[PDB]
Structure formats: C-alpha cells, structure tokens
Design a protein around this ligand. Structure first.
Ligand SMILES: O=C(N[C@@H]1[C@@H](O)[C@H](O)[C@@H](CO)O[C@H]1O)c1ccccc1
Ligand SMILES: O=C(N[C@@H]1[C@@H](O)[C@H](O)[C@@H](CO)O[C@H]1O)c1ccccc1
Lengths: 367, 367
C-alpha cells in the first residue's frame, strides 16, 4: 500500500529499474486543480506499488489530459509502455458508460476514452471513472489489503454493525452497503453496494450533492442562500468550499470581511469561534445528506473520505463536535424506528489517495 | 412467462403430471392482503410455467407464512418436494442480508429465512427479497424474454436513450440504470444498476419513499400535511393511497364527502373534476421523486409498475396529463444541464406478476 510522487523525469528514471520489469497499469487521479498520473504494479506479499507525477490543470480543461498522455508515451521507453496491462483514470464529474465524462463543475470540456492514446489505454481494459467511483474502489482495495483500521476511524458505531459483524467496527468494510461521502471542494458520493446473494461489493456512483435540500427547522437559512444563488439550494451548496464560505458570512454578519474556505479551516484550527461555528454549520448539512441517504440507500456504514477529512482531524477528535454531528445524523422522522441509529459512521484518519488505488483496483477487474 | 392460480388441492394434483418432473423453484409473493405461493418449472422452447395458490394474511402477521409453508409440504407428495432446487419469496418491507425482512407498515412481525422449512427453502439456494427487489428482477426477465414492448409503453423518451442504445425506447430495458417505482398503497422503489464494464444488471433495493420531501413552491401545501401528520412529510405521505385521499380533501375543502383512493381513482376515470385534480397533485409529487432520484441515481430509465398503473392507464394516455407530468419531471435546478431530460419514462401497460417472475429469476442466479 504505497505511492511515490515524482517529477516527470525521475518518474521515467524509476520505471526502468528491476522491480518495474513487471506488468503495469496506467492510472490518473484527475481533479479540478491538478492531475496525478503514473503506473502501478505488485511485488510479493500483497504489495501495492505506485509512482506517479503531478500536473496542473492549466487550461481548466479536461481535454488537456490528451496532451499529457502523448507527452508520456514518447518521452518513455516502449519497453515499459508495452508492459501496460490496463488504463484507468478518474475525473470529477458524471461519467456515462465508463467512456464519457462531463459536464464538469470545475473544468470545461468532455472526457472521452475514444480520444485516448491506446498505448496508455488498451481497448477492453480501459475505463474512465467518476472520482468517487474510483475512491469507492479504493475503499475496497484498502479493505482487501486488511489495512482498514490503519486508514479509517470509527466516529460512532451503529446498531446494526454487531448484527452483521463480530470483528470490531472499523476493522473491515463489513458485509453490508457502504456509503462513501467526500466533502471537499465539491461534495462527492458513492454507494458500495453489497450483494447478499454472492457476498460481493459493487461500486455505484451517485450524485447526492445535487439533490435539493429538504428542510428541518431551517427554512429561513435555506431561503437566505436561495436568494444569493437564485437557485433552490442543493446539498453541495451547503457542503462545499463555497458553502463553508457562506456559513462564515452568515456567522460574522459583516463584522469581519469574507475569507476563503481554506482560510476558514485554518482559523478554526486555531480556535477561532466564528470559523468553528461555520465548520459546525457545514457539518450539520453533511449530516443531513447522511440521514436522508441512510433511509433511501440503507447503508451499514457511512465513511467520510479525502485529505480534507484527514487534515481537519482537530474538528473530529473533539467530542462536543462529534456529539452534535451525531445529533444531526439522527435528525430524521424515521429515527423513531431506529434507521439512522443502525448506521456506523467512519472517517479517513490517515492520508491516502483512494482514487489511484481505485483506478488500479478497477484495472484488475477489467483484466 | 405464464402462470395459473389453482386451489391448494389441485396444485398438488398438477405437480404429479409428468411434465412437472422437472427441477422446481419454490416462489412466493407476499403482500399485506394476501400471499401467492407455488412452484416454477421450465419447459419447451425456453418456456416458463408457474402455478401457485392463494392465502389470506388474516392475522396481518408475516410469521403466519410459516404455517402455509408447512401446510404446503404436508399436504404435498414428498416425491415432488424433492424437486425443489431453489426457494425465493418477496415481502412488502425492507430486507437485510436476503434473510431478515421488517418490520412492515402493512403487517406485524419479522420475516426470517432461518425459520423456514428447508424443503422449500434449501440453504445456499434461497432468499427473501423486498417486493420491489423482486419487481426489479421481474423487469429484467421481461426484457430477456424479448417481450418488453408488450408490457411497457414509452411515456416520453429521454435524451440519453439513442446515445446508449440502438434499439427503440420501450423495446428493451437498455444498458443503463433503470429506476423502478411502484406507486401503489406504498411507494416502492428499486434501482436496476448497470455495471458498464461487465455489461451486467444488478438489482439494488431502495427506500426512496421515506426521504423527506424537498420543497418547490409548495411550502404551504407541505406545512398543511405536516400539521395533519405531526411528521415532516416524506414522498410516500404525498404519493400513496393516504396521500391521494389527502389531495382530494384539499381539493373539496368539505364540499363533498371523503372517500378511499380506490374510489377517487374510479371517480377520475369517469371524469370528476375534483378526482382528476387530486390525481394530478399526487402525480406532481411522484414526478418529484423522479426528478430528485434522476439526479441522485443517474438512471437511463424510470419505469412505473403495478396493477395500479395498468388500471389507471386512462390518466397516462391523456396527452395533457402527460405534458404536465413531463413538466414536473423536469422541474429541477439541475435541468439547466439537461439531467432530468436525459431520462426515459415508461409505464406498465399490461397486467403481469413482476414479483413472482422476479422470485424465479433470482432463484436462477442462486443455482
Ligand atoms: O460535477 C458534478 N458533480 C461532482 C461529482 O461528480 C464529484 O463526485 C464531486 C467531488 O469531486 O464534485 C461534484 O461537484 C456534477 C456535474 C453535473 C451535474 C451534477 C453534478
Ligand atoms: O414498509 C416500508 N417500505 C415499503 C417498501 O419496502 C415497499 O417496497 C413499498 C411497496 O410495497 O411500500 C413501502 O411502504 C418501510 C418500513 C420501514 C422503514 C422504511 C420503509
């Protein structure tokens, strides 16, 4: 279980050594800000081994990837390029047919597998994934490598965990549906479906973030945002970078000027009461995604992923914050039957590119 | 592909015929009112023959099923019971692990597979499905039988259809997600997921009906029902028999007597203005489930199913109601990117026991 971030040239260097004389998978973790592309292999002892290189999404254009791909094929020895098993990338938008990606909230353009160089993407062994589809595959990869409790932590255990599992919560993904939520720049979501027939986990990409927010006792608050956006607020409007910024503006009331999502997270990490208020308000809405999806999708577990989640551990390790999220996760009419209480909430507690692992885990299936 | 209801006694006679020496699958369709149970064999020319018998759910308790099971085997040749290779039943409520079902709105008790006679339910070859889970399996079976266009009509074709498929809308299930909705007494919902990299369909049970309804311009209407229920309304509150009655009361305001949904639908078929206005309100909220799920679950198709939908066909043939349902289905902020327009809507136009044939279908996957 390991990745090494390299410059484009040292990447080329490493790929000629003895350990890399093995079959290889091309992977790309593409975001609205950067792309991470490179190769993956195994040694022995279930060993997950990757090295990639960062790219900036300069043009803010998903089609820029084609230029990166070419650059990689020529600038590298085809003795390596011929060891390429499969080609899997993920992108931050809806993807249909594993072949077409778009439209994107961040970038312009359309991701097209058919316009991809077949050296990095062998036909019949290539996919374009949604970013949270990739990450879903990554959660599965982490589980299979028996290393779950190294990367995820229980926030609170739900009723049903012990009905399905004797091992401790957080030690395994569990034999039930796992809902993956990635509250970052945008709000990502996938359902790791579990087929009780053959005991298989199956990643199902979702767009929960774009659902219109249903109310609690917060009609005035929603209407305030409604009036700024000129749009019925969806979950992502509250749970996102722009949402966090909004939460901050509502807290301060002109008393401090607006600052960025990033700045608000840093502030709260220093005990700023205003930013902390904003962080809680953000999490109140994340939890509403959880409780509605708890009913609709019936998960055994809910997992919060992303570097965002790892880095804000100051917020999660506070028991008053945890208790309030928990309160909001149970704030649903159906809780009078225990449905939201059934569910176990975890969060990623250690850095790991789930998407790259997932692209690789996905490539094994296309193989 | 074809069934026959028989008295318990004569069903027992039927199985003794040499054409029923085939391997058999025990199936069972359980609703709040009654339960139909029987056996399915396969025949000449890939034919599928089922014959079943009926049962009143008198105590309104799901455990009552065990009696019928026992009674089945006791008043039945153990010569023919030996032929049972698979047993599958559906029940009208949530189910975990294909083995534990409940509790149910319309019945009391808990369906447990472990309490069932292994003569009918052979371990490792048996399951409990949710009713829409079975329906989903049924919808798959109708498609593979090449008889889709016979039982389903296109309400309107969506944008993605001719891109993903080559055959006409309504003639196959399609290689894409299919959301099945059963707006009846309860609101049923399942998602027939499509894995684009093994070309395969998988049935994922859902409880969409219990999500809190997000607003449109209907804050007052929602507050009204809210006060009547002393519960935040969920979609099933607006879309159900109880919901249809409620819509009819808000129409007449006391000017005419209250009446059952069944009689409201009858009244609309005859052309009562009040009834037709209730029917439209009901459908306005049914379309909202669709609009919200279209975004959240990214389906290629949405299919309305059940005896209900066939019987109240009149409502769907009227091009005026259709253009209004279609308008409500596109009533979503995300439609500015064409997401609601993507989806093709279909209705069941001919009677069929999706659930019974769903049980058999599931049974085949289990062998
Ligand atoms: O971009 C969209 N949704 C994206 C998701 O695909 C992604 O999982 C998430 C995290 O990166 O950011 C969201 O903004 C999107 C586009 C069009 C319609 C609805 C949603
Ligand atoms: O009964 C429930 N849900 C049922 C569904 O499972 C069923 O598919 C549908 C059609 O029969 O009617 C709903 O009312 C139910 C019970 C408890 C919690 C959530 C849902």
């Amino acid at each position: 279980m390991n990745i090494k971030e390299l410059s484009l040239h040292e990447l080329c260097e490493e790929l000629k050594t003895p350990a890399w004389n093995v079959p290889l998978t091309f992977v790309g973790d593409v975001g609205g800000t950067s792309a991470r592309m490179g190769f993956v292999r195994e040694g022995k002892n279930d060993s997950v081994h990757a090295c990639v290189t960062r790219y900036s999404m300069k043009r803010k254009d998903i089609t820029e990837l084609i230029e990166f791909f070419n650059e990689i094929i020529e600038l590298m020895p085809a003795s390596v390029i011929k060891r390429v098993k499969a080609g899997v990338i993920n992108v931050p938008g809806p993807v249909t047919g594993g072949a077409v990606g778009g439209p994107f909230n961040n970038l312009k353009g359309i991701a097209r597998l058919s316009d991809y160089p077949k050296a990095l993407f062998p036909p019949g062994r290539s996919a374009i994934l949604n970013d949270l589809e990739a990450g879903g595959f990554g959660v599965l990869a982490v589980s299979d490598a028996h290393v779950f409790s190294e990367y995820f932590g229980v926030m609170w255990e739900g009723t049903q965990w012990r009905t399905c599992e004797q091992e401790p919560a957080g030690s395994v993904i569990g034999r039930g549906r796992c809902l993956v939520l990635a509250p970052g720049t945008g709000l990502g979501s996938s359902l790791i479906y579990y087929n009780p027939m053959n005991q298989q986990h199956i990643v199902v990409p979702l767009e929960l973030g774009s659902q219109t927010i249903p109310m609690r006792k917060d009609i005035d608050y929603i209407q305030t945002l409604h009036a700024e956006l000129k749009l019925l607020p969806n979950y992502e409007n509250m749970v996102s970078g722009a949402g966090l910024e909004f939460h901050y503006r509502q807290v301060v009331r002109g008393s401090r000027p607006p600052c960025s999502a990033g700045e608000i997270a840093k502030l709260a990490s220093e005990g700023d009461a205003n930013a902390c208020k904003a962080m809680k308000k953000y999490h109140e809405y994340l939890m509403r995604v959880g409780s509605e999806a708890s009913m609709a999708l019936l998960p055994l577990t809910i997992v919060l992923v992303g570097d965002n989640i790892v880095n804000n551990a100051f917020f999660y390790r506070n028991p008053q914050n945890l208790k309030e999220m928990h309160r909001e996760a149970l704030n649903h009419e159906m809780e009078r039957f225990g449905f939201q209480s059934r569910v176990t909430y975890l969060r990623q507690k250690k850095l790991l590119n789930l998407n790259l692992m997932g692209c690789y885990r996905c490539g094994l299936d296309l193989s």
